[PDB]
């Protein structure tokens, strides 16, 4: 037969606009297509996007940024009023530290 195998021919790609001039590219069924479009737009842009951005924008300050700012304000106020240095190089009290007795 000069052939190698029985096979279907390669089909031509179907155009979604042929049977549906306003096809939205979701499904070949116009009703299912329109409803897929509607749900995608509603739950993607209207619900998740805008409401999620609003929820993120107004998240409570759990990172303690304003708290840290106010604590720094109090601490700077106290240290400037009492004449103490603004920040100490030691973060731990040397009294609670026991270095090795001998360095030789």
């Amino acid at each position: 037969p000069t052939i190698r195998l029985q096979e279907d021919p390669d089909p031509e790609d179907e155009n979604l606009y042929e049977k549906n001039p306003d096809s939205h590219g979701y499904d070949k069924d116009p009703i299912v297509d329109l409803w897929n479009m509607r749900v995608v737009f509603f739950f993607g842009f209207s619900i998740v996007l805008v409401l999620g951005s609003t929820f993120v924008a107004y998240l409570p300050d759990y990172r303690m940024q304003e708290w840290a700012r106010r604590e720094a304000e109090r601490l700077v106020k106290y240290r400037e009023a009492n004449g103490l240095p603004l920040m100490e190089s030691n973060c731990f009290d040397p009294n609670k530290i026991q270095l090795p007795e001998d360095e030789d």
């Binding site: 929820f55 107004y58 998240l59 409570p60 759990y62």
Partner: protein
Amino acid sequence: WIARTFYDGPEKNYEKTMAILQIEAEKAELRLKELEVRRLMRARGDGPWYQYPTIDKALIDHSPKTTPDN
């Protein structure tokens, strides 16, 4: 409103982390102790584990054996 509706206070997470840390540290110490116990028991053979069988003594026949010197 978001904090009231969806989230709790930080003390809950703080103390839950404390409990998780305690459980995990105890588990790690138990694992190390078990490893050392297995090592010692197998090296010495004086514990319940690694007890390999030996011949039963009750099988011996303690009767006169036809000869005075067994």
